[PDB]
């Protein structure tokens, strides 16, 4: 039988409320990014050219999490970007290094030299982003990094096989999230399948792609995820790459729509995670894996 | 496994007709609001500032149901709004207290000073509402009322069976059931089912709150264990609702919400739907409905 | 558990092709309306005031099937519409004729109208149809008992949906049974209905009629295939010429006095019969009999 | 018990990513059409009067494919459309063992026609029909084999039918069946048909219901050897109509689509990628290592 079974997305389920003693405020947002790296809030900016560059990795680490930079630039620009973040001259929170600064990241395309001048410039994590992680060309760029430079997050997968197979070769964290090619696995039943294995092993999960509203990210961590990757919903903000076009009745980031000051967006999303964790009586993300429960919504 | 069951809404089900002797007009719609407070029809008007103040709660009571004055005001104000109802010194299907005056209820917020004055005011039932009802703060405001005061108490919003066990065990006389930014909820039919597992065993009546678009839903609620439904947005711009009238684009608005005319037309229609459902299901009472009700699973179409 | 299963309607199903050796044109479309009465095409026009009166009851019985005069009128004038159809004296080829060789008519009654029945039978009516919104009632069983014990005749159920309902109804003497039922929140999807009602309809020679849920030619195929012997079309014969009303042009489309226009009903019946033929051909069935025997279907997830 | 389970279509399932040894730009699209005709891409153009004449069968077989000339013209008219293909006077061509491009022709219950098209030297005769598992379709298929060729039989979905048709004569099996009220959702239909016919090297052809490049991926993955594309090629320059502009957009009646190489290259790149994710070097590879999951409309 080629038919595995019913695969669920965020729109497919709602979360069941539990006995609660914790208020929205009290809740602990701290959690692990890799093993040796950790995030104060469980949100990390996406490795998309239209979203995450400079002022972004700023707002990302000073508000609690990390920010990942893309592979679509000449070396010295990803090197002169990471080094522009770590360097600085009532923003409370603030995620820092061990030599106490800021936090950043980078994308690696399957190459090894870009991973070199990155790690040397002092990069906290580097991600092996690839439209299909479970391979030979990627399974290998692992060992070709482990035995030279660092905590590595390997690119996107959706299978239980693709996660045992990956962590063995030293996968220090996993990105899950795979019309045209006709391939995919709905996001919930992915994380449900990928952390069913990424545990026992101390290896966290990053839910990449599909994040529309606050009550989405709740379900992600609830299911296994240790963090969540935020792309399109930050796409056109002020602190991202684009210029500005004023053309009547509307304003764009040059082509994409302007989504204002980024802080607000990360505030309204954190606020959602807070209200979610309240309802569910999870005091902290580790508690949300123990005390979850969800029902299926036949729309 | 995290996936428990599949959850169901009113829209997911259609009730199944059984053998029937009794006519839509000959059915009794008496139910219970709490162990000590009855109703003549199973409709309660929400504790929303767009729905119920005084003139609304009086409309409700005179028709069998009751109103629950919202808490979105001063303590002084709310004590006066319950009074105006207590002192209404025909209307044959009216709901009176053991003292011969119209019944009324009032909403209350987590953590008592408001409670006291309302129980002092003559309010009949106290509704302690919350986004999340199975919490420690809410249980704490429940036993810390039942010791200082003696009034009947309806509690919070709850969707799980664990939650309705504890609230009863702590002295709730009724419990209501109803829970995108959230990401949290169990659907109404599956919620009303689970909460009745526990409640219909202690004789404690359930109130079905929110999710009520039209007549069909009111029947479908009570059939799956609810003792009464609570109506809200359906009564939003009605003459007895709090706002003031005003004309904009050749249509009448309130305060903004689109005005719905006289309330009684709304509540007669709804009752007419319920009477009609218990006819198809051969039920001359609500406790009859609980015993002989059936439903099927609908996929859109 | 109050969950008694899933409820499937027409658009949840698709009929599965079988080994075939009959073409559309080759097929038998003959069936039973009751034990005693029978139809040449399995189509009843409704008993709504907007579709079946004398003029509509004729084009149905000419083309093979039948029509049931709506009850929304006085006693004597319904008798007149009845005796108007039993009297068509001046190709037909498919005409449904009785024992005297006149056109076939059925008529509708309700509540406990015992006197309307007496008047209709003696006027020559072939069936009486006892409608209630809910037919599994003590008031419909009291009326069935009393019509069947007295005025001979063939009586139709009313409106049932469960199997206990059709069972209880045949016990008291129902010759034909009728299946079909937001303001109330009640109902059972039409496929799931005809199946369970048909699970009890056979075992006795009692045929089942499909009332409601009928939009397209292909919902007729789906209904008879699951058990029905007859389907009752009505919604879609409302604007036709032969239904009561008044051609009355407003704006740029012709209406009725209140529904939109549909032209000649012959054109619809011929469209529906011809689509049934195409279906029966895919299922490799030369009758409804054979259809029931070899039918099969799968569930569609719409998209 | 009547109902025989939930049937699935392309939109209900997504494919599940496997262990991947292979690349996109490096897979053997190659496959089988009939027990003995091979194709360089698994796409065959349909026999609709509004899709496949000569200029199109050419476009197909030139790109690795093949095209079935329709039965909507007198015997003569059609036979000349075949002649124009078995007679061209870039690489990756699909040619028969004598160095001439490959053509199919359709027929449906019609010996006299069938012999002629064979005589004009056609590769495949296609016994197309509404309901394929009929009597008049067995007898037509039989009489044809006992008087000459290659034969495909016309749209079945039930597994029984894929058997009574192979059992006596069939070389390939085409799968695909509002007013109608009949059919089996496409994925379930291929699947049901493959399981009862993959045994013999008899290829199943996925006929119709196709939309985006993904669908081709899905359709083979489950068991089909080749997928036929119909309404996606309809209004391209190499099809039947004539070009004329009426208000903004150009038509043929149906909206214009442009060169057909572009409809195919894009469709070629979708199978490239699909197989890349499901890490199969070949099509026969894929029918051994293919998992899928269900989606709901939400």
Curated annotation (Swiss-Prot), chain A:
Record: residues binding NAD(+): 129, 177-178
CDD domains: IMPDH
Record's keyword annotation contains Lipid metabolism: no
Highest taxon of source: Eukaryota
Similarity annotation: Belongs to the IMPDH/GMPR family.
Regulation: Mycophenolic acid (MPA) is a non-competitive inhibitor that prevents formation of the closed enzyme conformation by binding to the same site as the amobile flap. In contrast, mizoribine monophosphate (MZP) is a competitive inhibitor that induces the closed conformation. MPA is a potent inhibitor of mammalian IMPDHs but a poor inhibitor of the bacterial enzymes. MZP is a more potent inhibitor of bacterial IMPDH. Resistant to mycophenolic acid (MPA) inhibition.
Chief location bin: cytoplasm
Entry protein name: Inosine-5'-monophosphate dehydrogenase
Sequence positions that bind IMP: 208-210, 231-232
Substrates-to-products reaction catalysed: IMP + NAD(+) + H2O = XMP + NADH + H(+)
Localisation: Cytoplasm
Keywords: Cytoplasm, GMP biosynthesis, Metal-binding, NAD, Oxidoreductase, Potassium, Purine biosynthesis
Curated annotation (Swiss-Prot), chain D:
Biological function: Catalyzes the conversion of inosine 5'-phosphate (IMP) to xanthosine 5'-phosphate (XMP), the first committed and rate-limiting step in the de novo synthesis of guanine nucleotides, and therefore plays an important role in the regulation of cell growth.
Subcellular location: Cytoplasm
Regulation: Mycophenolic acid (MPA) is a non-competitive inhibitor that prevents formation of the closed enzyme conformation by binding to the same site as the amobile flap. In contrast, mizoribine monophosphate (MZP) is a competitive inhibitor that induces the closed conformation. MPA is a potent inhibitor of mammalian IMPDHs but a poor inhibitor of the bacterial enzymes. MZP is a more potent inhibitor of bacterial IMPDH. Resistant to mycophenolic acid (MPA) inhibition.
EC id: 1.1.1.205
GO molecular function ontology, one term from the record: IMP dehydrogenase activity
Keyword Lipid metabolism: no
Protein name (Swiss-Prot/TrEMBL): Inosine-5'-monophosphate dehydrogenase
Family: Belongs to the IMPDH/GMPR family.
């Amino acid at each position: 039988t080629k038919n595995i079974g019913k695969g669920l997305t965020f729109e497919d389920i709602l979360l069941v409320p539990n006995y609660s003693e914790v208020l929205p405020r009290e809740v602990s947002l701290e959690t692990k990014l890799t093993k040796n790296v950790s995030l104060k809030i469980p949100l990390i900016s996406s490795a998309m050219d239209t979203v995450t560059e400079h002022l972004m990795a700023v707002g990302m680490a000073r508000l609690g999490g990390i920010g990942i930079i893309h592979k679509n630039m000449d070396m010295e620009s990803q090197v002169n970007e990471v080094l522009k973040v770590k360097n600085w001259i009532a923003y409370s929170n603030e995620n820092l290094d061990n030599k106490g600064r800021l936090r950043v990241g980078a994308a690696i395309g399957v190459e090894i030299e870009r991973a070199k001048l990155l790690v040397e410039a002092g990069v906290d994590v580097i991600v092996l982003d690839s439209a299909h992680g479970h391979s030979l060309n990627i399974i290998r760029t692992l060992k070709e990094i482990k035995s030279k430079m660092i905590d590595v997050i390997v690119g996107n997968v959706v299978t239980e096989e693709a996660t045992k197979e990956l962590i063995e070769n030293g996968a220090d964290g996993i990105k899950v999230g795979i019309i045209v090619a006709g391939v995919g696995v709905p996001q919930i039943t992915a994380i449900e399948k990928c952390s069913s294995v990424a545990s026992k092993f101390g290896i966290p999960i990053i839910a990449d792609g599909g994040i529309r509203y606050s009550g989405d990210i709740g379900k992600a961590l609830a299911v296994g995820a240790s963090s969540v990757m935020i792309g399109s919903i930050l796409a056109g903000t002020e602190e991202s790459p684009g210029e500005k076009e004023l053309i009547g009745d509307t304003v764009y980031k040059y082509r994409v729509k302007y989504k204002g000051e980024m802080e607000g967006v990360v505030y309204q999303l954190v606020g959602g995670l807070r209200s979610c964790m309240g309802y569910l009586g999870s005091a902290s993300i580790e508690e949300l894996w123990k005390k979850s429960s969800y029902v299926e919504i036949t729309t």
